[PDB]
mmCIF file with all atom_site columns, C-alpha atoms in Angstrom:
data_model
loop_
_atom_site.group_PDB
_atom_site.id
_atom_site.type_symbol
_atom_site.label_atom_id
_atom_site.label_alt_id
_atom_site.label_comp_id
_atom_site.label_asym_id
_atom_site.label_entity_id
_atom_site.label_seq_id
_atom_site.pdbx_PDB_ins_code
_atom_site.Cartn_x
_atom_site.Cartn_y
_atom_site.Cartn_z
_atom_site.occupancy
_atom_site.B_iso_or_equiv
_atom_site.pdbx_formal_charge
_atom_site.auth_seq_id
_atom_site.auth_comp_id
_atom_site.auth_asym_id
_atom_site.auth_atom_id
_atom_site.pdbx_PDB_model_num
ATOM 1  C CA . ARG A 1 1  ? 6.013  -61.281 -71.755 1.00 0.00 ? 1  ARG A CA 1
ATOM 2  C CA . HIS A 1 2  ? 6.757  -61.571 -75.472 1.00 0.00 ? 2  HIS A CA 1
ATOM 3  C CA . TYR A 1 3  ? 6.072  -58.012 -76.617 1.00 0.00 ? 3  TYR A CA 1
ATOM 4  C CA . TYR A 1 4  ? 7.278  -54.574 -75.531 1.00 0.00 ? 4  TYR A CA 1
ATOM 5  C CA . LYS A 1 5  ? 5.486  -51.247 -75.238 1.00 0.00 ? 5  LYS A CA 1
ATOM 6  C CA . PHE A 1 6  ? 7.062  -47.798 -75.518 1.00 0.00 ? 6  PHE A CA 1
ATOM 7  C CA . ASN A 1 7  ? 7.348  -45.831 -72.277 1.00 0.00 ? 7  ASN A CA 1
ATOM 8  C CA . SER A 1 8  ? 7.085  -42.042 -72.094 1.00 0.00 ? 8  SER A CA 1
ATOM 9  C CA . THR A 1 9  ? 10.566 -42.056 -70.564 1.00 0.00 ? 9  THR A CA 1
ATOM 10 C CA . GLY A 1 10 ? 11.993 -43.576 -73.741 1.00 0.00 ? 10 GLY A CA 1
ATOM 11 C CA . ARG A 1 11 ? 12.317 -46.935 -71.990 1.00 0.00 ? 11 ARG A CA 1
ATOM 12 C CA . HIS A 1 12 ? 10.520 -50.148 -72.933 1.00 0.00 ? 12 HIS A CA 1
ATOM 13 C CA . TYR A 1 13 ? 8.495  -52.605 -70.855 1.00 0.00 ? 13 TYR A CA 1
ATOM 14 C CA . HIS A 1 14 ? 6.613  -55.882 -71.265 1.00 0.00 ? 14 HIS A CA 1
ATOM 15 C CA . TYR A 1 15 ? 2.838  -55.798 -71.673 1.00 0.00 ? 15 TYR A CA 1
ATOM 16 C CA . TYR A 1 16 ? 1.784  -58.907 -73.584 1.00 0.00 ? 16 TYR A CA 1
#
């Protein structure tokens, strides 16, 4: 949990 990805909703979430 150091990087974020872009969500289709405009939100962000952890991936890596």
